[PDB]
Amino acid sequence: ERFDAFICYCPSDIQFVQEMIRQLEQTNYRLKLCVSDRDVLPGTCVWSIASELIEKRCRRMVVVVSDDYLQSKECDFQTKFALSLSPGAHQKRLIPIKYKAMKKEFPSILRFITVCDYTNPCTKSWFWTRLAKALSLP
């Protein structure tokens, strides 16, 4: 019902959502992720239910950024709705994640928020710690 993080992703990025399920929910972190393909019930508006999940039921929103993420549109609506709720990132509500090598530009609208980067081999040791800590605070 109530969650810790809404996960915004496209059909290609659902597998990093599986790694995320494993690492954040099936470990000592005990995080509750509102994966769309699992916790969003059919019959609900793909816009209104995401709006009232991000606004009133999840405390944060996680964006699994990629090239196939930019090719999507539902993810872009949800991302712009996240930024619209805490603009200027004053509430730490929006966590963009880079987990894969990209040959396209990072979303220019998310340029000023801190990207959790899984691609750097000398900083991956704090990836899951930082993500679980960011999802663990009010």
Swiss-Prot record:
- Substitution effect: residue 49 to T: Found in hematological malignancies; uncertain significance; somatic mutation
Phosphoprotein among the record's keywords? Answer: yes
Mutating residue 46 to F: what's the consequence? Answer: Found in hematological malignancies; uncertain significance; somatic mutation
Post-translational modification as stated in the protein's UniProt record: Ubiquitinated; undergoes 'Lys-63'-linked polyubiquitination. OTUD4 specifically hydrolyzes 'Lys-63'-linked polyubiquitinated MYD88. Deubiquitinated by USP3 that cleaves 'Lys-63'-linked ubiquitin chains leading to inhibition of MYD88-induced NF-kappa-B signaling. (Microbial infection) Ubiquitinated by human herpesvirus 8 (KSHV) protein RTA/ORF50, leading to proteasomal degradation ans suppression of TLR4 signaling pathway.
Swapping residue 61 to T leads to an effect described as:
Found in hematological malignancies; uncertain significance; somatic mutation; constitutively activates NF-kappaB complex activation
> Which parts of the sequence belong to the TIR domain?
1-135
Q: Tell me what happens on changing residue 21 to N.
A: In Pococurante (Poc); abolished MYD88-dependent sensing of most Toll-like receptor (TLR) ligands
GO BP terms in the entry: 3'-UTR-mediated mRNA stabilization; apoptotic process; cell surface receptor signaling pathway; cellular response to lipopolysaccharide; cellular response to mechanical stimulus; cellular response to oxidised low-density lipoprotein particle stimulus; defense response to bacterium; defense response to Gram-positive bacterium
Tissue specificity, in the record's words, reads: Ubiquitous.
Name any one GO molecular function. Toll binding
| A Gene Ontology cellular-component term | extrinsic component of plasma membrane
The reported effect of residue 123 to P is: Found in hematological malignancies; uncertain significance; somatic mutation; no effect on NF-kappaB complex activation
Write out the transmembrane intervals: none
> Which controlled-vocabulary keywords does the entry list?
Antiviral defense, Cytoplasm, Disease variant, Immunity, Inflammatory response, Innate immunity, Nucleus, Phosphoprotein, Ubl conjugation
Q: Where in the cell is it found?
A: Cytoplasm; Nucleus
Residues bearing Phosphoserine are: 86
Broad class of the protein's primary localization: cytoplasm
Indicate the quaternary assembly. Answer: Homodimer. Also forms heterodimers with TIRAP. Binds to TLR2, TLR5, IRAK1, IRAK2 and IRAK4 via their respective TIR domains. Interacts with IL18R1. Interacts with BMX, IL1RL1, IKBKE and IRF7. Interacts with LRRFIP1 and LRRFIP2; this interaction positively regulates Toll-like receptor (TLR) signaling in response to agonist. Interacts with FLII. LRRFIP1 and LRRFIP2 compete with FLII for MYD88-binding. Interacts with IRF1. Upon IL1B treatment, forms a complex with PELI1, IRAK1, IRAK4 and TRAF6; this complex recruits MAP3K7/TAK1, TAB1 and TAB2 to mediate NF-kappa-B activation.
Q: Which disease is it linked to?
A: Immunodeficiency 68: An autosomal recessive primary immunodeficiency characterized by life-threatening, often recurrent, pyogenic bacterial infections, including invasive pneumococcal disease, beginning in infancy or early childhood.
Q: Its biological function?
A: Adapter protein involved in the Toll-like receptor and IL-1 receptor signaling pathway in the innate immune response. Acts via IRAK1, IRAK2, IRF7 and TRAF6, leading to NF-kappa-B activation, cytokine secretion and the inflammatory response. Increases IL-8 transcription. Involved in IL-18-mediated signaling pathway. Activates IRF1 resulting in its rapid migration into the nucleus to mediate an efficient induction of IFN-beta, NOS2/INOS, and IL12A genes.
Protein's name in the database = Myeloid differentiation primary response protein MyD88
State the organism of origin: Homo sapiens
Section of the entire sequence shown:
159 to 296 of 296
